[PDB]
Homo-oligomer: A and B are copies of this chain.
Amino acid sequence: QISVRGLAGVENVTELKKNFNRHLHFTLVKDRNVATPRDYYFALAHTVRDHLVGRWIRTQQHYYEKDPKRIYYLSLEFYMGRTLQNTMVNLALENACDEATYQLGLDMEELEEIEEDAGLGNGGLGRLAACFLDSMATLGLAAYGYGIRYEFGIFNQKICGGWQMEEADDWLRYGNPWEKARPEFTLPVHFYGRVEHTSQGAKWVDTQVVLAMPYDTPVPGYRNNVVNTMRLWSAKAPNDGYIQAVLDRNLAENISRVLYPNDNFFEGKELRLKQEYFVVAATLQDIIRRFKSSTNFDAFPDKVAIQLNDTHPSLAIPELMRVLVDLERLDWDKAWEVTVKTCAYTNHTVIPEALERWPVHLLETLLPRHLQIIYEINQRFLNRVAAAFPGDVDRLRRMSLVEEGAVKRINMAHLCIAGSHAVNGVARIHSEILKKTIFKDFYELEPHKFQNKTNGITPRRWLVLCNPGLAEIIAERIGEEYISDLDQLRKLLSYVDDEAFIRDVAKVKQENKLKFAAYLEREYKVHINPNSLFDVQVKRIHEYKRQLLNCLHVITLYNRIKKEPNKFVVPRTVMIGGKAAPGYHMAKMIIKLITAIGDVVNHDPVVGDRLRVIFLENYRVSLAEKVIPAADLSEQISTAGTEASGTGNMKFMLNGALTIGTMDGANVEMAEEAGEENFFIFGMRVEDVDRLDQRGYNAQEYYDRIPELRQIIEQLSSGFFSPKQPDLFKDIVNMLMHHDRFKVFADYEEYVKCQERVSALYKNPREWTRMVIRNIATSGKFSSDRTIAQYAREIWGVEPSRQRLPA
């Protein structure tokens, strides 16, 4: 036992054991002689869940009595990962459960590995929602997460012949012990139909109804006895040839069947639009119901805050208007005032292909009334623009919520800005770019709406839970208070010259690496050298994230070794992992290239154990918890101006890895906090990128001037990495040479040079560790508690509280 895991009291352990046996018997209907590890996992899960119940019921009862302003976080993604360990940590039950299971003859880690990840998200945006829920509970806010209970989350990735294969993520197969179905709270959602204009107001009729059934999952705060709720909706068909009619119910229920895995290119698919309205319509009725139980909607914004995670739930704006105007009978102007003061929008990217632009004909058929409301919103908004900038007809077309052209579309981002009192970017540089480029016109019209809220990650899951060894040595010296006040890590700077601490920091990292190296062999049968530098790049596969630039460096290292075999080089294990969206051809070709490189490099006798290339299969939250604590070097190399913020970068910094990256997204603030001397910065800044675009990017120039780069391209073209299929990577070479929107070649030279400096420092164990200490010590700003406290104070208008609850 380690301290930060709580106390293992005698009667506490005694109680856990009897309840464990009680659940195995009564709940699982099992007996010790036939129970399997999975059965034991569920017994433990139900045992821990029991401890949540009392707190969950009184927290909600408390909000009913106090009636504080309620925060509603709307998102179509909640990348939760596993729940068991996180629950024990927040309830201070980890050591007790560890002891209790030990006495029962069971290994708790083994049991924890049985839980399926709740992968209801694609990557950053979904995981941000998850960290936010944790921080909002830890800060005592009356917050509710609202989304969709997908029967199938992000697909499980299988690598066959070096290619990605997608497999259904049937995460509910064995059941979900954490959720509680609330069929009694089912609500109706309407689709299609037509709008009738009677004497007194518009009426939406002849609609098809789909029921929204909620499932509640508890969200425990960190040791403050606060347990908030994450409510996820499931689609159900109303009960009203016979056989075919029953079988056709599936049509309606398909709405909550699966998570769309396309995080790169917006697809105007009808099913996706249905999902977006489904979550919005059910959620708003729930919100209003709770409000009416606290008819003067003037106080609505004082009791309700709705945060839109990107434009995915943007229909909340016209839906709130529909309800207030059509159902509650408020006049337009009043309803609009309430709507704007209630809603706030968060943008996550400036890349055009990711922005939602719904075809008018789709909204016309599916949501006829909302389209009319959107047109009216646009009309009134443009009248305001026309009055502020008389005669500027071009601005009018640019700011319109309706885009003209081949097919008319609705720009959901413009809709969100017009209908929100606050719009924020997720990193200082990103928020600035929003004001200077993409949303410049809106900023000039309403400057007060634009804010910045730099992202963060929760130190519970991303430190205490996944790196107990590091959390312990830190606590030994500054206490446990930093876990909910991460800024305290700064006190660690006074230990940068402490020989003992330096030794412990390095020991923990070594232990994490051996632990991960072992895992690689157990569950994947691959052998790596634990003494090599762990060079890691894990995140979804995208051209802008430039996994390709990493590949070029790897090949360069390989070619240099083959050039001078007996020359010493710092050993490296290069790990790249991440999923590619199913229809993203280039991303899939990049995964293939990575494995192809490994096939050559990992079997070259001359290389030995000096260089290894491994593709981490099925990267997901639970895998991130294993690899991040074991990393030495974090690759954050997106083209300057493309990664809005990034969050994986923060996870690595908090866990003892140094960072090599561009001045993009949050990397800028990270370097600023730790000091540029303690970061491995390289490449073009946003300004350099622009200037290059003015001139015109010509990749051929770099190819002609850099011999090493030329050699790599020729190897790719000639089939050096694909003997049986010589032209296998022709698409990659053609993209790099003629239409690379992300300028991979432009940063190649500086990148390779920077990597040499990384290797130089790694050769000096003591100085590498001292730099690590300086990074960990200054990672405090990146806690989602800080992010949430800012949202609370500057956007929602509520004060966070660290005050514990009762028992």
The reply to whether A582 and B167 form a contact with Cβ atoms under 8 Å apart is: no
Query: With an 8 A cutoff between CB atoms, is A170 at the interface?
Result: yes
Residues in chain B near residue A174, CB distance under 8 A: 183-184
8 Å CB contacts to B: which residues of A434-458?
none
The reply to whether A261 and B240 form a contact with Cβ atoms under 8 Å apart is: no
Name the residue in A56, A249, A261 with the highest tally of chain B Cβ atoms < 10 Å from its Cβ.
Answer: A249
8 Å CB contacts to B: which residues of A39-54?
50, 53-54
Stretch at the interface among A23-31, A524-532, A753-761, A769-777: A23-31
The reply to whether A31 and B61 form a contact with Cβ atoms under 8 Å apart is: yes
The reply to whether B582 and A241 form a contact with Cβ atoms under 8 Å apart is: yes
Residues in chain B near residue A243, CB distance under 8 A: 258, 260, 269, 271
Query: With an 8 A cutoff between CB atoms, is A166 at the interface?
Result: yes
Complex Cα gap A53–B24 (Å):
11
The reply to whether B184 and A38 form a contact with Cβ atoms under 8 Å apart is: yes
Query: What is the oligomeric copy number?
Result: 2
0/1 per residue, A236-256, Cβ < 8 Å to B?
110111110111011000100
Residue in B29, B168, B180, B582 whose beta carbon sits within 8 Å of that of A180 in the complex? B29
The reply to whether A168 and B239 form a contact with Cβ atoms under 8 Å apart is: yes
The reply to whether B254 and A258 form a contact with Cβ atoms under 8 Å apart is: no
Residues in chain B near residue A30, CB distance under 8 A: 57
Residues in chain B near residue A183, CB distance under 8 A: 173-175
| A36-B184, A184-B36, A247-B254 as given contacts; A242 in contact with B31, CB under 8 Å | no
Q: In the complex, what's the smallest C-beta–C-beta distance from A264 to chain B, in angstroms?
A: 14
Complex Cα gap A240–B157 (Å):
11
Residues in chain B near residue A29, CB distance under 8 A: 53, 56-57, 180
Query: With an 8 A cutoff between CB atoms, is A181 at the interface?
Result: yes
Query: With an 8 A cutoff between CB atoms, is A155 at the interface?
Result: yes
Complex Cα gap A61–B25 (Å):
14
Residues in chain B near residue A675, CB distance under 8 A: none
The reply to whether B36 and A242 form a contact with Cβ atoms under 8 Å apart is: no
Complex Cα gap A249–B614 (Å):
33
Residues in chain B near residue A170, CB distance under 8 A: 239
Query: With an 8 A cutoff between CB atoms, is A583 at the interface?
Result: yes
The reply to whether A31 and B50 form a contact with Cβ atoms under 8 Å apart is: no
Residue in B50, B57, B247, B582 whose beta carbon sits within 8 Å of that of A258 in the complex? B247
Query: With an 8 A cutoff between CB atoms, is A152 at the interface?
Result: yes
Query: With an 8 A cutoff between CB atoms, is A610 at the interface?
Result: no
The reply to whether A242 and B184 form a contact with Cβ atoms under 8 Å apart is: no
Residues in chain B near residue A180, CB distance under 8 A: 29
Complex Cα gap A762–B184 (Å):
48
Residue in B56, B57, B168 whose beta carbon sits within 8 Å of that of A246 in the complex? B168
The reply to whether B26 and A240 form a contact with Cβ atoms under 8 Å apart is: no
8 Å CB contacts to B: which residues of A191-225?
none
Complex Cα gap A25–B166 (Å):
41
Query: With an 8 A cutoff between CB atoms, is A274 at the interface?
Result: no
Name the residue in A29, A38, A184 with the highest tally of chain B Cβ atoms < 10 Å from its Cβ.
Answer: A29
Closest to A165 in B: B240
Q: In the complex, what's the smallest C-beta–C-beta distance from A169 to chain B, in angstroms?
A: 8
Q: In the complex, what's the smallest C-beta–C-beta distance from A223 to chain B, in angstroms?
A: 21
Complex Cα gap A173–B237 (Å):
11
Query: With an 8 A cutoff between CB atoms, is A766 at the interface?
Result: no
Residues in chain B near residue A155, CB distance under 8 A: 242
Residues in chain B near residue A166, CB distance under 8 A: 242
Residue in B38, B184, B242 whose beta carbon sits within 8 Å of that of A582 in the complex? B242
Query: With an 8 A cutoff between CB atoms, is A257 at the interface?
Result: yes
Q: In the complex, what's the smallest C-beta–C-beta distance from A61 to chain B, in angstroms?
A: 7
Closest to A581 in B: B242
Q: In the complex, what's the smallest C-beta–C-beta distance from A270 to chain B, in angstroms?
A: 11
Q: In the complex, what's the smallest C-beta–C-beta distance from A721 to chain B, in angstroms?
A: 27
Complex Cα gap A170–B272 (Å):
27
The reply to whether A25 and B53 form a contact with Cβ atoms under 8 Å apart is: yes
The reply to whether B271 and A258 form a contact with Cβ atoms under 8 Å apart is: no
8 Å CB contacts to B: which residues of A639-691?
none
Q: List 13 other contacts, CB 8 Å, given A30-B57, A174-B183, A175-B181.
A: A25-B53, A29-B53, A31-B57, A36-B184, A168-B237, A168-B245, A168-B249, A173-B183, A242-B261, A242-B582, A243-B258, A243-B271, A250-B254
A-B residue pairs in contact (CB < 8 Å), sample of 19: A26-B50, A26-B53, A29-B53, A29-B56, A31-B57, A36-B184, A156-B239, A168-B239, A168-B246, A170-B239, A175-B183, A241-B582, A241-B583, A242-B582, A243-B258, A243-B269, A243-B271, A247-B258, A250-B254
Nearest first, the 10 closest Cβ-Cβ pairs linking A and B are: A242-B582, A250-B250, A168-B239, A246-B258, A29-B180, A174-B183, A167-B239, A170-B239, A26-B53, A26-B50
A binding-site residues for B, Cβ under 8 Å: 25-26, 29-31, 36, 38, 50, 53-54, 56-57, 61, 152, 155-156, 166-168, 170, 173-175, 180-181, 183-184, 236-237, 239-243, 245-247, 249-250, 254, 257-258, 260-261, 269, 271, 582-583
